[PDB]
Amino acid sequence: TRDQNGTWEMESNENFEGYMKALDIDFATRKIAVRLTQTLVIDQDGDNFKFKTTSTFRNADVDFTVGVEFDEYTKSLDNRHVKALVTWEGDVLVCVQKGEKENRGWKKWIEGDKLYLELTCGDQVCRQVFKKK
Template sequence: MPANYSGTWDMVDNQNFEGYMVAVGIDFATRKVARMLKPQKVFEQDGDSFIIKTFTTLRNYSCSFKIGEEFEEITKGLDNRKCQTTVNWDNDKLVCVQKGEKKNRGWTHWMEGDTLYLELRCEDQICKQTYKRTA
């Protein structure tokens, strides 16, 4: 049985977010504000079906998917690009591949105890975020 990600997670660390945002194509003004944000993630998981909600004081984002099923994602509120997205299990890690304008784009989530890790990838940039479970 894969890991259960359900819960609420608050960001505690964010490394190379600027480099990732530049690679994705986010404008300077938005990057300046986004660097100061401390997102909260809420995972709702029912087996292989997920809803991941990301809340910030600037924008909120929600993504729903089922493991192994490709879907069209519009990264509204982020960089507003359309991509074909697939999320799969790699042991207990959630691994996302986003096919579209940007090369090598996607993310990986994994947990160790009450810590959630997120690695964001785009082109040659990797952003590493750490979250702590709050509920």
Template structure:
């Protein structure tokens, strides 16, 4: 398993608006989200992972065990209830979210010294790249 656990600062963000449109997020909230710099903190304790996504506007935390389906409420994002399942696919930590939106989920992986994240929903894919936080 790759060393995802660290604090990461966003470097690039491609097609966030398309992804948010697919989720049904309002134009006003999309405009705000496009200006926000996010940080990710990925932690592991035993077999449980916690991913915290923080910004000056909103924070979102998800905790899960790989291979165990769980109920997720995407509060503060698109406010939906989904069934989520996170698995390892090679070196990628992949989440499938089953609910009202089709083909929804995400994948995190390390490439060189960067954290890559793909968020996808109904054919739209947002690609984000993060670098390790220099203050950690």
């Protein structure tokens, strides 16, 4: 069939590294791109095509119990070992990540249909808002 309509989820991706290198994509980009999976939405009407591509990476799960310290390696980010302790302050979930970096941690809380997340390291604060889907 010529009908390529649909949502397509990447199963395999061989020699993406060599293709990207032949395009002169730089090392640090290739290092990340080779880890992604791709979803392709093809909307086809006769010979008219619309391609919609999203690229995706799954991070490692994190499992913990409130009140019991656990070891973390932040492979997702700086790949450091921290000793993380999560506690409740009211309805605010508070994590201190004990390690090399000062004042490293986060706070998480629900307000309405929004989840608020405040990441901290040193004097820097990053504020993220999520919507319940």
